Amino acid sequence: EIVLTQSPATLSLSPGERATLSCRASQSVSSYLAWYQQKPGQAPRLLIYDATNRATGIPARFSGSGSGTDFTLTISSLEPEDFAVYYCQHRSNWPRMFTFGQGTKLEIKRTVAAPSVFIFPPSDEQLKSGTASVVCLLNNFYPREAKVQWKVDNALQSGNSQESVTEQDSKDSTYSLSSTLTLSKADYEKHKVYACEVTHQGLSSPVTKSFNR
Amino acid sequence: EIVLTQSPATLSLSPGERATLSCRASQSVSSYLAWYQQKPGQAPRLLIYDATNRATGIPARFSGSGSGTDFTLTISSLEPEDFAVYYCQHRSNWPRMFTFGQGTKLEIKRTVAAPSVFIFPPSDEQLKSGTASVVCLLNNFYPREAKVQWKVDNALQSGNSQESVTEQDSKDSTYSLSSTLTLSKADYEKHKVYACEVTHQGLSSPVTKSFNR
Amino acid sequence: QVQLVQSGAEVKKPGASVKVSCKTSGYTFTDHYMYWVRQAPGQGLEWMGVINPDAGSVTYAQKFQGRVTMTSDTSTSTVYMELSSLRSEDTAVYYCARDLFFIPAANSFDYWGQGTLVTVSSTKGPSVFPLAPSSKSTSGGTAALGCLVKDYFPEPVTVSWNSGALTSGVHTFPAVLQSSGLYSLSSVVTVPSSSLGTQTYICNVNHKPSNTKVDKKV
Amino acid sequence: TNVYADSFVIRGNEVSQIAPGQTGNIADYNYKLPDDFTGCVIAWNSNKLDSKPSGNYNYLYRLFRKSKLKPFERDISTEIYQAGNKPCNGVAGSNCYSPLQSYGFRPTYGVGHQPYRVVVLSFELLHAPATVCGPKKSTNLVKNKCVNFNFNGLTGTGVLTESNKKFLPFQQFGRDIADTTDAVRDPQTLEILDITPCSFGGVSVITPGTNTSNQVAVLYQGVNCTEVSN
Amino acid sequence: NATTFASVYAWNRKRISNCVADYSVIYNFAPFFAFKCYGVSPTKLNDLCFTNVYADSFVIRGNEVSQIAPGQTGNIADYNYKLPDDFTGCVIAWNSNKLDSKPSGNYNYLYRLFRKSKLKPFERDISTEIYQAGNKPCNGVAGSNCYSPL
């Protein structure tokens, strides 16, 4: 089938400038294409249909164009209510095969904030905070591209860590990341040093926070 | 054959009052019925035969009656040696297919005692063998309605636990229940039982005895 | 105004069928087609599929092709969708979308519904655990307090601090599906180090499907 | 699956305006066909049925519309059209116009202003249950030429010729004493074609002897020299 | 006495010929659970000197053993192995759960589900052409309705 693929998949810009997100295909879909907009927490809305005309209830800032096998959306001015995920769909005539792509997220351009690295030891009177759930906090950071490393007695651990990333806050345009390394009580009492290594673009050197049991 | 069915199947009364246990059938068995009495730990004795006359070696308190397709036993006064299980059997003439029912247990009416909830972690000697059995104790309760819920680290384990209920004690008319959750040593090391939820009629709220391994 | 109302939440088990309805309103349910689209957490729209309001002339998707039945009804103007044999990869939010054209043609989707979070697993109750930082974890004059809820499958929990009185610096992380099949997340709040020991912080955890409310003091 | 038949009468100069991708005054503010119309534009002349020596106040064209109509849109409203900066809450003023107007089809008008009846068959190509029965197969009957026949289940090979077998008005099979399935009645029509063997016989090779020569002759016993040198 | 066995669509047939075969040692190799000799008799396999002895091997499901019969239809009887109606030979089958069953499941044995036609007797096809279940052309990519035949 027509594999609608989007090359950028991450359009990090600033509110006020212009945006150009491309969604190309293989078959001639010059007059067979639709554009949607899915905001987090609600249903996707129709942005531009038929790829040539404007839809109803759409502001004048949204302008779509393209023909052949290369299409792009030309936004006039970005607004705080415009940062969302956009998709593309072609309309096959004879076979009902409406397919979609992957989605492109629209970010807000700001300064590169350094991640505030915090580590929490498992509390007592409740066994190791839910079966050794060591939490390493990563808050206030802009370019989400940091991998969390868990070192137990200078030994690197992998496969037992879970990461949770929040959405972009509308106040400071930063993200929050929490890493949970799940272990057992015996493995917790058998080791002494537990470190959380954070490597981020805003950090000139990897920041490692550790505590002694 | 004639499916002898007993509706109550649990006759909870007090010693001194009168009892009426019913055992109905379908075919005309007005003159074809027998009544037995099986005490726990011995052989069933003949209580009333032919459903109309008294048997030999039977006290005057046992009085049976009934005709047609509805029969019942009329005990004069309940005694401590009378609490047992009773059955019913009809005597088919041509096809010798003597069938029985299910049995009705005679309880002692007392106050609703609260179950004493206790839990026992597995000893290290058992952990060395590769198995882990967490025993949760339920002693001193009048009605037998103490379902046991096992949530190993808040995870329902219905089916992996075996319950053992003792007979009614002749001293305080209470019951005892022992819930033993059989698990492996690896599961006991990686996880934690932490929960033995007891819900009984005598308890205003489900008492969940929790501990740390 | 045209507003497509759908159902709420719906839990299931592997090898079953879920009945989700999406009633129409505002427009005459004889002229406009409808589509049923799936939105997975983190993924995008996956399957198409149209249901004719007039007759049973429907067209299921190609991925399923035999395990979904979309019926029609002109009495109450409500569509139905019964996916059979739900697996561990069908848990998503199903939507109902209309079309900007009439019966014959179909260009795209204009009017959408509200969604229906369908999941396939066993549900239980939550378990709240306090998150206390160490004495050496105070960096930059600030300290973070949190609560780690765990072992709950449904995630409508809104972890509020001090019954909603504390909202600044509160960050609620999305739920993560653990290996045991139960979701869990953490909710932390950044407070100055000068407020440690003087102000009482209590995290309010409320889980509506299990009717469990646990207030854990930090 | 289901064909939607839409019939309507239009002017005589707009027969080609209702087509996929065409901006017409009766094709943009009226019934519009999309760029994916998989039907036909079957139409004919009606200068004999819809014609009448009168004012012809029967049809209209619906030109005055606020916005462009969607494909297959049927607007039944009769609201007063407003061009701009002139609201008409009562009667239509000088700037307000009615969305309907008489379509005068005079019988003396030539091609271009005659009443034409146009019906478009909207062929739905949605993958769905097709016809309740299914495509009926149909082949023209061949007469004097051996054809394998399967009429209403009377399977057999043979030459189907014309017969004087006036069948009693209710039968169909038609057999013989030696139980051979002879005459069969046309399932469709009421014609009776008697069957015959498919011209079989026996080949006999006349040889004057290999010692004498090698030229031989073949005798086809039971052949009229029509079913295949002197 | 082998350990490596191909799937059901493959045969790995080894033509045993030009050497005097003895059918008495096969009863001491492994305890068999099925012995169906169509046309021949197990007791008199020794004296009978056949010309060509074809030997194929394939793993099959327990509920699919009954489909291995001359003139039998089924999922693994019309699209994976078609036995002729005049088949003269034996059918040896035995369970191998102790060697071809891992706790995480073994996905190395593939079977063909359905084709446009049925296999003729004594045919082997290893073509991996992805099946097209629908009316849309599949350009050799496993997608929504373009399911792999294996």
Numbering used by the authors:
A (entry chain D), B (entry chain F): 1 to 213
C (entry chain E): 1 to 218
D (entry chain A): 393 to 620, 640 to 641
E (entry chain C): 343 to 492
Lines quoted from the article behind this entry:
To understand the broad neutralization mechanism of PW5-5, we determined the cryo-EM structure of PW5-5 complexed with the stabilized prefusion ectodomain of Omicron XBB S (6 P) and SARS-CoV S (2 P), respectively. Therefore, we shortened the incubation time to 15 min and frozen the sample directly without further purification. Cryo-EM characterization revealed three conformational states of XBB S–PW5-5 complex: the XBB S trimer with two up-RBDs binding two PW5-5 Fabs (state 1), the XBB S trimer with three up-RBDs binding two PW5-5 Fabs (state 2), and the XBB S monomer with one PW5-5 Fab (state 3), with resolution ranging from 3.1 Å to 3.7 Å. Thus, binding of IgG PW5-5 results in S trimer disassembly. The Fc region of PW5-5 is missing in the final structures because of its flexibility. Structural analysis showed that the binding of PW5-5 induced RBD to shift outward and enter the “extra wide open” state, resulting in conformational instability of RBD. This phenomenon is similar to n3130v inducing S trimer to form a “wide-up” state, but the deflection angle is larger, causing S trimer to be more unstable. In contrast, PW5-5 and PW5-535 bound to more conserved epitopes hidden in RBD with non-overlapping epitopes, and most likely belong to class IV mAbs, explaining their breadth in neutralizing different variants.
In this study, we reported the isolation of potent and broadly neutralizing mAbs from a vaccinated donor with a special five-dose COVID-19 vaccination schedule. One mAb, named PW5-570, displayed the most potent neutralizing activity against all SARS-CoV-2 strains prior to BA.5 variant, and another three mAbs, named PW5-4, PW5-5, and PW5-535 were found to broadly neutralize all sarbecoviruses tested, including all the current SARS-CoV-2 variants, SARS-CoV, Pangolin-GD, RaTG13, WIV-1, and SHC014. Cryo-EM analysis demonstrates that these antibodies have diverse neutralization mechanisms, such as disassembling spike trimers, or binding to RBM or SD1 to affect ACE2 binding.
